[PDB]
Write an enzyme that holds these catalytic residues in place. Structure first.
Site, short mmCIF file in Angstrom:
data_model
loop_
_atom_site.label_atom_id
_atom_site.label_comp_id
_atom_site.label_asym_id
_atom_site.label_seq_id
_atom_site.Cartn_x
_atom_site.Cartn_y
_atom_site.Cartn_z
N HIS A 10 -24.23 22.81 -9.42
CA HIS A 10 -25.28 23.67 -8.63
C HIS A 10 -25.21 23.71 -7.26
CE1 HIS A 10 -27.97 20.29 -8.94
NE2 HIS A 10 -28.35 20.79 -7.71
N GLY A 17 -32.65 17.49 -2.42
CA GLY A 17 -31.56 16.74 -1.67
C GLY A 17 -30.87 15.53 -2.53
N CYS A 47 -29.73 15.25 -5.44
CA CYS A 47 -28.90 15.86 -6.30
C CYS A 47 -27.38 15.29 -5.95
CB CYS A 47 -28.90 17.39 -6.49
SG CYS A 47 -30.51 18.12 -5.86
C1 LIG Z 1 -31.02 17.87 -7.30
C2 LIG Z 1 -31.93 18.94 -7.65
O1 LIG Z 1 -33.11 18.77 -8.23
N1 LIG Z 1 -31.53 20.23 -7.69
C3 LIG Z 1 -32.03 21.30 -7.91
C4 LIG Z 1 -31.86 22.59 -6.88
C5 LIG Z 1 -31.81 22.05 -9.33
C6 LIG Z 1 -32.66 23.02 -9.89
C7 LIG Z 1 -32.60 23.29 -11.14
F1 LIG Z 1 -33.46 24.25 -11.66
C8 LIG Z 1 -31.55 22.81 -12.00
C9 LIG Z 1 -30.72 22.18 -11.38
CL1 LIG Z 1 -29.26 21.31 -12.20
C10 LIG Z 1 -30.87 21.74 -10.07
#
Ligand SMILES: *CC(=O)N[C@@H](C)c1cc(F)cc(Cl)c1
Ligand SMILES: *CC(=O)N[C@@H](C)c1cc(F)cc(Cl)c1
Lengths: 304, 304
Positions: free
Chosen positions: A41, A143, A145
């Protein structure tokens, strides 16, 4: 003596953290050898997240669109591919700090350390367990992620988790390092609900053995039980059923303390039925389930 | 979101851990620049520990009696001195991995990370607080002596603790990096008892603010109180008295949540008087006091 929720030393993993940016989206990547792994993503805008077609969004991306920064130096991206929900960015430089590593897919009930990162920089380390509903209860802000979960066997890092998202209930979902989500979750901004978060019975038993080793023995009762009888109570209290495989794994703790596994099950049954009565075990007023039998052995023996 | 007991990433400290042996006694040392710091009881036999005269035992020791091993390589000791309860071993090589550092002496209530080590090798990292009775509740086995506690301000490690001993009640005592014990403890195998382990009130309040930020709001009550009224209840429950300095430090959390500090004190007073009624706050059935207001701000903002 003393028993703490302890994470693995994080140095070997800190040396792998990088920042990955695609357009306006920035998250963390894991740099091992000449590959940087990160959630796919990273290619999405906030609008794309509502219903992303990742193969389609990826057609609009070239190697030069992925900006990878290690410390304050840019890495050259020479290839990119999608494997399930992760991107693998081939860079022209092998990470000089690459530890010995493996990618493992863990089972519910297994624990691991998370190195929470922002912008490729480590903020902290904590210990998690993969819940029986395949979520983790972490501490992740926007952030985070791409932050990873791992275990260490002396000098080998086994990476088991990469953080992808937070459910509307505040629990967390992610993938193994092959990009396969734990549980039924998808990387989309669509409401997804977690199933029953049951208690990891084998881990609570391990922790009651840690408590006895460390001098907290008040809960030890005069009873025993059988697996079938214990499991009737486990079911009622939303605890995971105990199998002979779990009894086998608790064998070394049973040997060290001289407390038969089924006797410890009977003490746990009484704690479930009677409650703690305002008392604590290893400084907790609830039964802790995020220490595996191996974690207890490791901490009580001093493995480095 | 989510809130975890999080330790600082340990890499910068792992790069400083060495093994120190004097005769048959082995423990951990901290190698910063060309000095290795370690507990002075490395010079003692088990018999010496009952009533050691450290200046006298040190007369029988020369530089070559201290064996310092970094990884699997021996360091050459070219000087040694005793500063309070620590030895400083001057080596001929500066630690190439020396981070930016300071030595700080913390106050009770302050938290820090411990990198538990055995034979100069890191086993795990966890978060502690200096208790109001100047003990810490750690996880330390034989050979963990010399493991250190620290905080990190971006790239600067502030070392605040070195582990020396375990009291007969299983709680821990140690020194700052100048070798001065926290509290009244001495490095001798003589029974020493800890004073009242009161609850760090300002930290519980900080953690209740973390709970509100993270969606756990059930405990929020319709009352307010004053410092004097709250402190009467704090006294009864063995909580530390709250001062205006603590109220000042909680200001940013009060601002972020819109909950006045005294209103949160009134909610804590009701929790003390009514108990949790089988409910949890941030997954705990007790009021957590090992997060400072700065820790909560840091974790809820994502400082790296
Ligand atoms: C790390 C995180 O939370 N990323 C967000 C932007 C996100 C939102 C979402 F709906 C699904 C994913 Cl995989 C990631
Ligand atoms: C690290 C540790 O526990 N060391 C032991 C040998 C010890 C015993 C003792 F009585 C006093 C001290 Cl300072 C250390």
């Amino acid at each position: 003596s003393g028993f703490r929720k302890m994470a693995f030393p994080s140095g070997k993993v800190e040396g792998c953290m990088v920042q990955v940016t695609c357009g306006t989206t920035t998250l963390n990547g894991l740099w091992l050898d000449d590959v940087v792994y990160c959630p796919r993503h990273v290619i999405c805008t906030s609008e794309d997240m509502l219903n992303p077609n990742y193969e389609d969004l990826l057609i609009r991306k070239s190697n030069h669109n992925f900006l990878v920064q290690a410390g304050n130096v840019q890495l050259r991206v020479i290839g990119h591919s999608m494997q399930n929900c992760v991107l693998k960015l081939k860079v022209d430089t092998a990470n000089p700090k690459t530890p010995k590593y493996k990618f493992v897919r863990i089972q519910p009930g297994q624990t691991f350390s998370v190195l929470a990162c922002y912008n490729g920089s480590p903020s902290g380390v904590y210990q998690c367990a993969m819940r029986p509903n395949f979520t983790i209860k972490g501490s992740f802000l926007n952030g985070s992620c791409g932050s990873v979960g791992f275990n260490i066997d002396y000098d080998c890092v086994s990476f088991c988790y990469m953080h992808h998202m937070e459910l509307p209930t505040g629990v967390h979902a992610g993938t193994d390092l092959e990009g396969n989500f734990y549980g039924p979750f998808v990387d989309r901004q669509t409401a997804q609900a977690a199933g029953t978060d049951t208690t990891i019975t084998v881990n609570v038993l391990a922790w009651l053995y840690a408590a006895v080793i460390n001098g907290d023995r008040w809960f030890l009762n005069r009873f025993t039980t059988t697996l079938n009888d214990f499991n009737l109570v486990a079911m009622k209290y939303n605890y995971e059923p105990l199998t002979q495989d779990h009894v086998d794994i608790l064998g070394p703790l049973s040997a060290q303390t001289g407390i038969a596994v089924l006797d410890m099950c009977a003490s746990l049954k009484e704690l479930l039925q009677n409650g703690m009565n305002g008392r604590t075990i290893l400084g907790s007023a609830l039964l802790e389930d995020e220490f595996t039998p191996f974690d207890v052995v490791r901490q009580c023996s001093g493995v480095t």
